[PDB]
Amino acid sequence: EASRPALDLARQAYEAFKARGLNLNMQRGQPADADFDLSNGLLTVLGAEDVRMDGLDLRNYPGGVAGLPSARALFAGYLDVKAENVLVWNNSSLELQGLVLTFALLHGVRGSTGPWLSQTPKMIVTVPGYDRHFLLLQTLGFELLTVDMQSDGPDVDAVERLAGTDPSVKGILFVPTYSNPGGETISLEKARRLAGLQAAAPDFTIFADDAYRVHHLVEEDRAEPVNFVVLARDAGYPDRAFVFASTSKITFAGAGLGFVASSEDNIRWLSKYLGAQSIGPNKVEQARHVKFLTEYPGGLEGLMRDHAAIIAPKFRAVDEVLRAELGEGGEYATWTLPKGGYFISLDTAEPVADRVVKLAEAAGVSLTPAGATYPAGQDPHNRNLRLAPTRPPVEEVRTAMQVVAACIRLATEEYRAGH
Amino acid sequence: ASRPALDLARQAYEAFKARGLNLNMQRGQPADADFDLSNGLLTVLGAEDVRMDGLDLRNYPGGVAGLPSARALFAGYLDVKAENVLVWNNSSLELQGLVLTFALLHGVRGSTGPWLSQTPKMIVTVPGYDRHFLLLQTLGFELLTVDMQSDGPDVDAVERLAGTDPSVKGILFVPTYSNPGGETISLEKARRLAGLQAAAPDFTIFADDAYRVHHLVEEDRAEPVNFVVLARDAGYPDRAFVFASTSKITFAGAGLGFVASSEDNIRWLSKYLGAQSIGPNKVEQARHVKFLTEYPGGLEGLMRDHAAIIAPKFRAVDEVLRAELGEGGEYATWTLPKGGYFISLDTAEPVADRVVKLAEAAGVSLTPAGATYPAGQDPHNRNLRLAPTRPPVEEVRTAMQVVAACIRLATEEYRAGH
């Protein structure tokens, strides 16, 4: 297994890439300029004539903390629920998650017997997962209990074991459609089983961050998203599901719309605490998104297809280069080929993930730090690496992945040879 | 007491009730004409104005603290530098709720622990703003009230409440054209609050400066104070959090909420906002920067245009109330503010709740009695908040004519034993 000539060939190959003096990046989970160009109509969609919607002046306070009726109606169809179930806020889905989780800590959710903050709260998370979810939960005071992400959703067996005995395990927070970073969509069997599991806490909640529900890259053989609001209700736990969603990768990143779907009773609960600290959300921004997305050619699906034409070639660019340089046998690394979402999960064969990022940096390729997909200082393997191919052009992605491929081979031969 | 006077008041009230009116004097909302001044804001940015401050407004990068130009513009608003300001989304009340929650969960910059596990009290001003009391009580604070004086809050009461007990964590009030009294804090009271001997080392001043530039008179305006500079010069640089809003400047609910504080406090606030958000709406901040910079006469020109619509409604409230109740304060006394969005009326006798119920039966929706104090803690039953900005000047007179008749009926009933 240990080979000196292969170590020399890997070193020379690495020297050749380093000598280019590159300055590429493969960690930015951001759309391209071409993606943002598609939504420029949104900036000028409303005017002096379009100031009134749903019997309300968009420029004045009245309307309710829940958002515009048309916004609540549009995103009801997005999340496969009714208007009464959906609440639309401002530019961030993560903010609305942080608000809901903070209200649960301060006041307790609908079916609770006290505030979560005083009960030593645990939150189940999925690994490899999203770095900002772990940071958010740990900032608010939740202890993270990790479960492994399987190909068709989380390890539900592990979720039932953790949630079954201890009442302090207050919930699960994960991405059900095209997960970050593995791109795994939760199966109906697992979604139904999550929606009705025997949990110790009677206020056990599912925080489904459905950030990539309609974000399809493949045209026909797509992932079918589940409906936790409907599944939880049919399972006998109507208040269990909070299905969060976003328009950041649909319209503008950071100038979109964050929103959540849940039971009508949970929306009243959430409306009380939002109402205590706010008169209401940006009603004019919600009206722009409603008017633009309704008036867009081919509707919402038409815009996501236009994004796919720009984004999909970048994903195949990562597959083609990485497969041609590392092979299909999985000698140096294995990786996902997701049908939607914004990321690709690459697992190096040997425990050299941190070495690949340090090598890549010196070559001029910024990769996501090793251990980012697990909770801070809790990566037991040192193999997983997140790749964000959506931002740069197809040419730069190829070059970046050739440099990453060369780093994986150099990192692998070092480990095998004792270096 | 007088029976003939009670009959004349009854007959006058029945005349107004017989009309079958449907007026409102409690909505603290700008009029249709006020929002029309800012219709250019809707279409101010296009495909050519996508970039600003070396950043693409449609993309994530930029920082949690907001646009450099937004930070620079609202620095001038609050008389500070760009490093002191943090611009968020559409609500100042939200930004206060976020800052107060972070203090409860984590503690402010100079804290020894989280405020939540210290049985925290918050000093409030009475008569004050109903939403401040609701927000603080929702978050877990116990409200200790201090009386509002003509030139600001009762600072002697504030020192006594904050001096001994470390549990008393701050003061939350409006220093310019306060809700509802319209009082602006004096320089010596502002300086004295900025340097008072507080028991808690993390004592914080939550200055909701919601009406800083909202002037209704040309000459003899209120001069706002700079708590960020006053606190720094006093030796407590991290004490002041000066909040502000564009809600009554551009659009109500579609404006911008922001806060001014020490550079170190912004880093503290930026940590917890950053943990739950990539950043604020950068496109909305760009629209406000471009619109306000390009407006005829600047921001002061826009406030003077709002004054042209708003000021005549304030004068109508004063004219009708002086003519029907007199100037000697027999039935009631009231504020003649130089700016802001409200008028504070204090009835002579404790019959405020009766005046509101009488006004409701006569078709005039007034703010509920006791709204200006914390929930169930109104020891007088005299104060009533009046919001004259929303309806037209014609409807403001008619509404105040009915209210004037309700005060006289309620006064004659009390004196006569009913």
Q: Per-residue DSSP letters for B389-412?
A: SSS-HHHHHHHHHHHHHHHHHHHH
State whether residue A129 sits within 8 Å of chain B by CB.
no
Chain A closest-CA separation from residue B46 CA (Å): 6
Do the Cβ atoms of A33 and B47 come within 8 Å? Answer: no
Nearest to A46 among B42, B90, B116 (CB): B42
Amino acid at B50: V
Tell me how far apart the alpha carbons of residues B262 and B109 are, in angstroms, rounded to a whole number.
10
Residue A2 burial by CB count (10 A; 0-12/13-18/19+): exposed, middle or buried?
exposed
| B228 within 8 A of B266, measured Cβ to Cβ | no
* Shortest CA distance from B35: residue in chain A: A59
A152 and A68 share one domain: yes
B2 and B101 share one domain: no
Tell me how far apart the alpha carbons of residues B265 and B256 are, in angstroms, rounded to a whole number.
20
Helix (H) or strand (E) holding A412: helix A394-416
Which range marks the domain in which residue A392 is found? 1-50+297-419
* Alpha-carbon torsion (A130, A132, A136, A138), positive or negative: positive
- CA A42, distance to chain mean position in Å, is 24
Do the Cβ atoms of A47 and B42 come within 8 Å? Answer: yes
Tell me how far apart the alpha carbons of residues B251 and A288 are, in angstroms, rounded to a whole number.
15
B86 and B110 share one domain: yes
State whether residue B98 sits within 8 Å of chain A by CB.
yes
Determine phi and psi for A318, rounding to 5 degrees: -70, -40
Name the experimental technique: X-ray
* Alpha-carbon torsion (A163, A167, A169, A172), positive or negative: positive
Q: Within 13 Å, how many C-alpha atoms sit on residue A326's CB side? A: 31
Q: How many CB atoms lie within 10 A of CB B327?
A: 9
- In chain B, which residues are followed by a C-to-N distance beyond 2.5 Å, i.e. a gap? none
Phi-psi region of B343 (alpha: psi -120 to 50; beta: other; left: phi over 0): beta
Determine phi and psi for A305, rounding to 5 degrees: -70, -40
Helix (H, G, I), strand (E, B) or coil at A115: coil
Chain B CB contacts of A281 under 8 Å are 90, 253
| B191 within 8 A of B171, measured Cβ to Cβ | no
Nearest to A92 among B98, B277, B283 (CB): B277
Given resolution (angstroms): 2.6
State whether residue B179 sits within 8 Å of chain A by CB.
no
Chain A closest-CA separation from residue B43 CA (Å): 5
Structure tokens given for B79 = 């008389």
CA angle (B362 as vertex; B357, B368 as ends), nearest 5: 30
CATH code: domain of residue B103: 3.40.640.10
B32 and B45 share one domain: yes
| A173 within 8 A of A123, measured Cβ to Cβ | yes
Do the Cβ atoms of B275 and A47 come within 8 Å? Answer: no
Do the Cβ atoms of B105 and A140 come within 8 Å? Answer: yes
Tell me how far apart the alpha carbons of residues B53 and B68 are, in angstroms, rounded to a whole number.
6
Beta strand spans in B76-198 (E):
85-87, 121-126, 142-149, 152-153, 168-173
Q: Within 13 Å, how many C-alpha atoms sit on residue A235's CB side? A: 22
A284 and A204 share one domain: yes
Burial B93-127 (b: 16+ CB within 10 A, else e): bbbbbbbbbbbbbbbbbbbeebbbebebbbbbbbb
B400 and B415 share one domain: yes
Helix (H, G, I), strand (E, B) or coil at A392: coil
Amino acid at B402: V
Q: Which among A369, A69, A394, A390 has a CA at the least distance from the CA of A253?
A: A390
Residue A114 burial by CB count (10 A; 0-12/13-18/19+): exposed, middle or buried?
exposed
Tell me the H-state helices in B210-297.
Answer: 227-234, 263-275, 282-294
A283 and A188 share one domain: yes
DSSP state of B22: -
B265 and B333 share one domain: no
Tell me how far apart the alpha carbons of residues B179 and B175 are, in angstroms, rounded to a whole number.
10
CA angle (B295 as vertex; B289, B296 as ends), nearest 5: 155
Which of A296, A320, A335 delimits the end of a domain?
A296
| B210 within 8 A of B174, measured Cβ to Cβ | yes
* Shortest CA distance from B284: residue in chain A: A255
State whether residue A47 sits within 8 Å of chain B by CB.
yes
Residue B418 burial by CB count (10 A; 0-12/13-18/19+): exposed, middle or buried?
exposed
Nearest to A277 among B58, B94, B253 (CB): B94
Structure tokens given for A418 = 């004792």
DSSP state of B368: P
Beta strand spans in B177-275 (E):
204-208, 240-245, 257-261
Determine phi and psi for B225, rounding to 5 degrees: -100, 155
CA angle (A49 as vertex; A46, A50 as ends), nearest 5: 40
Q: How many CB atoms lie within 10 A of CB B160?
A: 12
Q: Distance from first CA to last CA of chain A, Å, rounded?
A: 13
Across-strand partners of A242?
A207
Nearest to A252 among B140, B275, B283 (CB): B283
Tell me how far apart the alpha carbons of residues A53 and A73 are, in angstroms, rounded to a whole number.
13
With a CB-CB cutoff of 8 Å, which residues 366-385 of chain B face chain A? Answer: none
DSSP state of B42: G
Chain A CB contacts of B61 under 8 Å are 30
Q: Which among A185, B56, A316, A346 has a CA at the least distance from the CA of A356?
A: A346
**In sequence order, what are the residues at sequence separation of 6 or more whose Cβ sits closer than 8 angstroms to the Cβ of residue A34?**
A310
Q: Is the peptide bond before A181 cis (omega within 30 degrees of 0)?
A: yes
Q: Distance from first CA to last CA of chain B, Å, rounded?
A: 11
Which of B272, B295, B318 delimits the end of a domain?
B295
B290 and B310 share one domain: no
**In sequence order, what are the residues at sequence separation of 6 or more whose Cβ sits closer than 8 angstroms to the Cβ of residue B228?**
B78, B79, B80, B84, B240, B242, B260, B261, B262
Amino acid at B271: K
Q: Mutate which of A46, A91, A289, A307 to disrupt the B interface (most B C-beta within 10 Å)?
A: A91
B84 and B213 share one domain: yes
* Alpha-carbon torsion (A340, A344, A347, A351), positive or negative: negative
Amino acid at A286: Q
For helices A299-326 and A394-416, what crossing angle results, to 10°? 40
Q: Which among B200, B127, B209, B135 has a CA at the least distance from the CA of B161?
A: B200
- Which residue's structure tokens are 């939540």? B116
B115 and B186 share one domain: yes
The strand pair at B142-149 and B121-126 is best described as parallel
The total number of residues written for chain B in this structure:
418
Do the Cβ atoms of B253 and A283 come within 8 Å? Answer: yes
Q: Is the peptide bond before A238 cis (omega within 30 degrees of 0)?
A: no
Q: Mutate which of A135, A270, A282, A391 to disrupt the B interface (most B C-beta within 10 Å)?
A: A282
The strand pair at B55-56 and A143-150 is best described as unpaired
| B374 within 8 A of B132, measured Cβ to Cβ | no
Chain B closest-CA separation from residue A330 CA (Å): 35
- CA B74, distance to chain mean position in Å, is 18
Amino acid at B399: A
Q: How many CB atoms lie within 10 A of CB A361?
A: 13
For helices A264-277 and A93-107, what crossing angle results, to 10°? 90
Nearest to B253 among A36, A60, A94 (CB): A60
CA angle (B278 as vertex; B108, B276 as ends), nearest 5: 45
The total number of residues written for chain A in this structure:
419
Across-strand partners of B260?
B85, B242
With a CB-CB cutoff of 8 Å, which residues 8-37 of chain B face chain A? Answer: 29-30, 32, 35
Tell me how far apart the alpha carbons of residues A128 and A370 are, in angstroms, rounded to a whole number.
11
Q: Which among B122, B121, B188, B195 has a CA at the least distance from the CA of B149?
A: B188
Q: Which long-range contacts (CB under 8 A, 24 or more apart) does A317-323 make?
A: A317/A389, A317/A394, A317/A397, A317/A398, A317/A401, A318/A344, A318/A387, A318/A389, A318/A397, A318/A401, A320/A398, A321/A397, A321/A398, A321/A401, A321/A402, A321/A405, A322/A346, A322/A401, A322/A404, A322/A405
Determine phi and psi for A136, rounding to 5 degrees: -60, -50
Tell me how far apart the alpha carbons of residues B361 and B355 are, in angstroms, rounded to a whole number.
10
Which of A258, A276, A296 delimits the end of a domain?
A296
Q: Which among B318, B323, B350, B320 has a CA at the least distance from the CA of B334?
A: B318
Tell me how far apart the alpha carbons of residues B395 and B22 are, in angstroms, rounded to a whole number.
10
* Domain total of chain B: 2
A336 and A242 share one domain: no
Do the Cβ atoms of B105 and A141 come within 8 Å? Answer: yes
Q: How many CB atoms lie within 10 A of CB A45?
A: 20
DSSP B319-333: HHHHHHHTTTTSSEE
CATH code: domain of residue A366: 3.90.1150.10
Tell me how far apart the alpha carbons of residues B396 and B390 are, in angstroms, rounded to a whole number.
9
